[PDB]
Amino acid sequence: KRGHVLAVPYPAQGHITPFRQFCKRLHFKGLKTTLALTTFVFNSINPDLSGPISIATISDGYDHGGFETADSIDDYLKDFKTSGSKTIADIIQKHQTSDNPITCIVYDAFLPWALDVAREFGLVATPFFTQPCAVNYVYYLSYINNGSLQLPIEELPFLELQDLPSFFSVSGSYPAYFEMVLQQFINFEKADFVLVNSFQELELHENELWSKACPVLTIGPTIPSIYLDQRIKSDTGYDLNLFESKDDSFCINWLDTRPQGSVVYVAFGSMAQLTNVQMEELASAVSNFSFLWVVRSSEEEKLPSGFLETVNKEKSLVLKWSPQLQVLSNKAIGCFLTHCGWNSTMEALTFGVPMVAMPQWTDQPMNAKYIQDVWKAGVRVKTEKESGIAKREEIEFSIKEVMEGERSKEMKKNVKKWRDLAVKSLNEGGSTDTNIDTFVSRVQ
Ligand SMILES: O=c1ccn([C@@H]2O[C@H](COP(=O)(O)OP(=O)(O)O)[C@@H](O)[C@H]2O)c(=O)[nH]1
Ligand SMILES: *[C@@H]1O[C@H](CO)[C@@H](O)[C@H](O[C@@H]2O[C@H](CO)[C@@H](O)[C@H](O)[C@H]2O)[C@H]1O
Ligand SMILES: *[C@@H]1O[C@H](CO)[C@@H](O)[C@H](O)[C@H]1O
Ligand SMILES: O=C(O)c1ccccc1Br
């Protein structure tokens, strides 16, 4: 009971969730954990603190209003390095006289400066990669190549430019975030271990390639235990959400009154923003189906005029935020139109839901390529070359390809083999169970 992990996610939903889920595993194995949330995020969730994973607050420099009050992405990350470094040190020192001093920092790989804080205080330090081995390996190859990538990639020759992370195909876009994903590797060889939210059997080739460069420990998937290994009976869902929902049994009760495989689930995660015009094509494309579609509150104005008032309530429903785990487990879902965020993707693979892949940016085009051409668990929507955006007829056809055809009955078959592979990896003797045990052994 000696060790104590301070877990520091990037302050965004797709990072806090895998970090929190990992702390639940660690707790079940006997490791005390504290999750470090920025003050802005802490005051927006108003989390419940009567649980096994304690909360500390840190600062990113934007306590009052968070990321949106920052002038720019580069200012946000630079200020987060400054205030995050001091406030993480502040937590370490505050715990020094305690019963369990902090002994280890698990920090988002996006934040390599947290390793410097951990090393200053003599702690174990491990970066935690919330994206898959293939993506991280591609970034790693580019980092050692001075931030460039020339195709084809010898060890991954099937990758075309339209499949690389958006930073390589949209020249110059988001330079602060491109620098960030490259600099994940600035010091990661000096950490005690490198953690990845994937499982070895999902990406055998890429895990082994990347491990030659630096030993990594796959410790995923971070989907709650009740849906997979079922060894942690208290781990029943995602219980830190940055978004409010209508306390939705509303959503699951409704899915129950629908025929099996009949509903198209549409969601774009917590971050991705679609333009006026992209929302028009989408709204027209999906209205040919029975659909359950998450349109985040900030995105509603970009819906076509009078759209919310003309959805057939018998066949379709529009939500502000979904209990995505319960939706993807409900058998009313015939397919998942997704932005190919890594959590959504892994969730879809394990619940055996075939995908319509509609990536937008960052690592999402990589996940899309793997969904269609490596795992063969779905089809990618074709976007216009000159205008860049997927038109209504190409989205409707992609959904059809997954819902009905001969292509459809192949992708259902292949997508169901991943659940048991993950259950095996999480059960005793599994790949991921062994790696977690290795980490727990070092920490204490
Ligand atoms: O309406 C929604 C949309 C997303 N999610 C969850 O939010 C996470 C999104 O993470 P991902 O890596 O897919 O995408 P990002 O939001 O980081 O772009 C996932 O755990 C989803 O299950 C949810 O619960 N309800
Ligand atoms: C990275 O930059 C992009 C803008 O290009 C931001 O969307 C993102 O901010 C995230 O936005 C979410 C809400 O849509 C918040 O939940 C999240 O905490 C915040 O980090 C920047 O991270
Ligand atoms: C960065 O760019 C993509 C579209 O190119 C958008 O989906 C994100 O919301 C934005 O941050
Ligand atoms: O790719 C991601 O997960 C991501 C999330 C949040 C901010 C920036 C990025 Br580049």
Author numbering: 4 to 447
Manuscript text:
UGT74F1 and UGT74F2 are the enzymes responsible for the in vivo glucosylation of SA in A. thaliana. In UGT74F1, glucose is transferred to the hydroxyl of SA, creating a glucoside; in UGT74F2, glucose is transferred to the carboxylate group of SA to create a glucose ester.
We crystalized UGT74F2T15S and UGT74F2T15A in complex with UDP and SA or UDP and 2-BA. As the findings with both mutants were identical, we will present further the structures of UGT74F2T15S. In contrast, UGT74F2T15A and UGT74F2T15S form both SGE and SAG; UGT74F2T15A has wild-type activity for SGE formation, better than UGT74F2T15S, and both mutants form about 5-fold more SAG than the wild-type. Relative to the wild-type enzyme, mutation of residue 15 to serine or alanine in UGT74F2 did not lessen the specific activity for SGE formation, but did increase the formation of SAG. Perhaps the presence of a branched amino acid at residue 15 constrains SA binding in a particular conformation and functions in organizing the binding pocket.
